[PDB]
Design an enzyme around this catalytic site. Structure first.
Site, mmCIF file in Angstrom:
data_model
loop_
_atom_site.group_PDB
_atom_site.id
_atom_site.type_symbol
_atom_site.label_atom_id
_atom_site.label_comp_id
_atom_site.label_asym_id
_atom_site.label_seq_id
_atom_site.Cartn_x
_atom_site.Cartn_y
_atom_site.Cartn_z
ATOM 1 N N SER A 162 38.688 28.098 -103.899
ATOM 2 C CA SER A 162 37.768 27.358 -103.049
ATOM 3 C C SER A 162 36.399 28.021 -103.061
ATOM 4 O O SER A 162 36.268 29.217 -103.357
ATOM 5 C CB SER A 162 38.298 27.249 -101.593
ATOM 6 O OG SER A 162 38.245 28.477 -100.915
ATOM 7 N N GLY A 163 35.393 27.273 -102.664
ATOM 8 C CA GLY A 163 34.063 27.843 -102.506
ATOM 9 C C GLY A 163 33.096 26.722 -102.255
ATOM 10 O O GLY A 163 33.399 25.775 -101.513
ATOM 11 N N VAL A 215 40.243 23.475 -104.318
ATOM 12 C CA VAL A 215 40.928 22.870 -105.471
ATOM 13 C C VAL A 215 42.382 23.350 -105.564
ATOM 14 O O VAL A 215 42.643 24.569 -105.581
ATOM 15 C CB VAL A 215 40.225 23.193 -106.814
ATOM 16 C CG1 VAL A 215 40.892 22.408 -107.965
ATOM 17 C CG2 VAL A 215 38.702 22.865 -106.791
ATOM 18 N N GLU A 253 41.402 16.359 -114.521
ATOM 19 C CA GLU A 253 42.278 16.985 -115.543
ATOM 20 C C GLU A 253 42.419 18.481 -115.329
ATOM 21 O O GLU A 253 41.509 19.141 -114.795
ATOM 22 C CB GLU A 253 41.738 16.799 -116.962
ATOM 23 C CG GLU A 253 41.657 15.361 -117.445
ATOM 24 C CD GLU A 253 41.082 15.322 -118.884
ATOM 25 O OE1 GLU A 253 39.894 15.685 -119.097
ATOM 26 O OE2 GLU A 253 41.866 14.963 -119.811
ATOM 27 N N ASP A 287 24.083 23.250 -113.854
ATOM 28 C CA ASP A 287 24.704 24.539 -113.552
ATOM 29 C C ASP A 287 25.560 24.984 -114.722
ATOM 30 O O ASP A 287 26.692 25.411 -114.538
ATOM 31 C CB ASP A 287 25.536 24.437 -112.252
ATOM 32 C CG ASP A 287 25.802 25.789 -111.576
ATOM 33 O OD1 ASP A 287 26.794 25.851 -110.774
ATOM 34 O OD2 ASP A 287 25.046 26.761 -111.826
HETATM 35 C C1 BI1 Z 1 34.594 30.311 -110.215
HETATM 36 N N1 BI1 Z 1 35.491 29.161 -110.202
HETATM 37 C C2 BI1 Z 1 36.927 29.353 -110.329
HETATM 38 C C3 BI1 Z 1 34.850 27.862 -110.004
HETATM 39 C C4 BI1 Z 1 35.875 26.743 -110.091
HETATM 40 C C5 BI1 Z 1 35.047 25.538 -110.471
HETATM 41 N N2 BI1 Z 1 35.867 24.351 -110.622
HETATM 42 C C6 BI1 Z 1 37.011 24.318 -111.371
HETATM 43 C C7 BI1 Z 1 37.477 23.030 -111.252
HETATM 44 C C8 BI1 Z 1 38.694 22.583 -112.019
HETATM 45 C C9 BI1 Z 1 39.894 23.317 -112.461
HETATM 46 C C10 BI1 Z 1 40.366 24.710 -112.173
HETATM 47 C C11 BI1 Z 1 41.168 25.389 -113.088
HETATM 48 N N3 BI1 Z 1 41.371 26.608 -112.517
HETATM 49 C C12 BI1 Z 1 40.740 26.698 -111.301
HETATM 50 C C13 BI1 Z 1 40.674 27.719 -110.335
HETATM 51 C C14 BI1 Z 1 39.938 27.486 -109.160
HETATM 52 C C15 BI1 Z 1 39.286 26.277 -108.912
HETATM 53 C C16 BI1 Z 1 39.364 25.262 -109.859
HETATM 54 C C17 BI1 Z 1 40.089 25.493 -111.035
HETATM 55 C C18 BI1 Z 1 40.599 22.341 -113.322
HETATM 56 O O1 BI1 Z 1 41.721 22.551 -113.892
HETATM 57 N N4 BI1 Z 1 39.969 21.166 -113.454
HETATM 58 C C19 BI1 Z 1 38.823 21.292 -112.749
HETATM 59 O O2 BI1 Z 1 37.978 20.330 -112.658
HETATM 60 C C20 BI1 Z 1 36.593 22.262 -110.510
HETATM 61 C C21 BI1 Z 1 36.609 20.927 -110.092
HETATM 62 C C22 BI1 Z 1 35.560 20.464 -109.292
HETATM 63 C C23 BI1 Z 1 34.543 21.347 -108.891
HETATM 64 C C24 BI1 Z 1 34.558 22.668 -109.293
HETATM 65 C C25 BI1 Z 1 35.598 23.151 -110.091
#
Ligand code: BI1
Length: 273
Positions: free
Chosen positions: A14-15, A20, A89, A135
């Site tokens: 999260s953040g 997620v 996905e 970004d």
């Molecule tokens: C520094 N991190 C881990 C930022 C995560 C950013 N991020 C990953 C994801 C996603 C995935 C992630 C795959 N591993 C993850 C771990 C932490 C959070 C998200 C994910 C994924 O499989 N598909 C995604 O779109 C995402 C989706 C919407 C907005 C931001 C997203």
């Protein structure tokens, strides 16, 4: 519904992008990522062709999610009384590029060429769909470790692509260009090429070139690793202080360092398996 259609697994992270969760689509066991954001935490709103009030992130994802691409695609979304839920996905196995570089260190030029090529193609796709990501960075790139394919994530800072100036920016500062720092003004494509110069340096050096505002605007690029003169030249060109001195996507992909790129599957075989 959502909960009959998706089986929700553990929190992935999260953040600023919301929360997620890992999930599976119940119909075919497809791995998905299930992202939640409170409505009160959404700053940028847009609307869909049919005129629904949705997060801008949904508008931008719908625009880039048609056909195959190096973008993580939006498979569905739901509105709840106080939040939106986005079904995305999920490659498996997966690692983001930040973690990959942190664990492995600076990448071999062959591997950085393959990865950087895939990112360029993914960004061209966005731009062709009318979308500016804003970004591009290592944390926003997922690697499908079995396929050797890179995929762009997190459109939460994006905008519709336009040819006029942007005066708002809420992407990552250290990937942000000197014109934003100095003037709070940038144009979309040349700002994207700056972020790609940062990303390329990060791949081959194992870290970003600039920490402070003053280094960003001084734009002196010092290398911490052995990097070929061709790769240095491309990086320095992408990082030109003057936005109009930066290469187009065409000029980047025509650069001598960009020749003889490996396809994703062979990239995986040589470097990832
Ligand atoms: C520094 N991190 C881990 C930022 C995560 C950013 N991020 C990953 C994801 C996603 C995935 C992630 C795959 N591993 C993850 C771990 C932490 C959070 C998200 C994910 C994924 O499989 N598909 C995604 O779109 C995402 C989706 C919407 C907005 C931001 C997203």
């Amino acid at each position: 519904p959502l909960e009959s259609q998706y089986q929700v697994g553990p929190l992935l992270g999260s953040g600023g992008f919301g929360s997620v969760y890992s999930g599976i689509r119940v119909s075919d066991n497809l791995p998905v990522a299930i992202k939640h954001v409170e409505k009160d935490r959404i700053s940028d709103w847009g609307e869909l062709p049919n005129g629904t009030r949705v997060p801008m992130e949904v508008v931008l994802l719908k625009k880039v999610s048609s056909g195959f691409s190096g973008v993580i695609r939006l498979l569905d979304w739901f509105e709840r009384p106080d939040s939106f839920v986005l079904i995305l996905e999920r490659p498996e196995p997966v690692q983001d590029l930040f973690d990959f570089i942190t664990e492995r260190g600076a990448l071999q030029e062959e591997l950085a060429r393959s990865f950087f090529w895939q990112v360029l193609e993914a960004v061209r796709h966005c731009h062709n769909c009318g979308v500016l990501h804003r970004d591009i960075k290592d944390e926003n790139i997922l690697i499908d470790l079995n396929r050797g394919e890179l995929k762009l994530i997190d459109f939460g800072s994006g905008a519709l692509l336009k040819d006029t100036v942007y005066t708002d920016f809420d992407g990552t500062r250290v990937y942000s260009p000197p014109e934003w720092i100095r003037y709070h003004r940038y144009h979309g494509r040349s700002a994207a090429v700056w972020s790609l110069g940062i990303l390329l340096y990060d791949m081959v050096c194992g870290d970003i070139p600039f920490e402070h505002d003053e280094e960003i605007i001084r734009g002196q690029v010092f290398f911490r690793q052995r990097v070929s003169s061709e790769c240095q030249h491309l990086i320095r060109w992408c990082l030109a202080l003057r936005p109009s001195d930066r290469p187009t996507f065409e000029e980047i992909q025509n650069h001598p360092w960009m020749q003889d790129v490996l396809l994703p599957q062979e990239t995986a075989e040589i470097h990832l398996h």
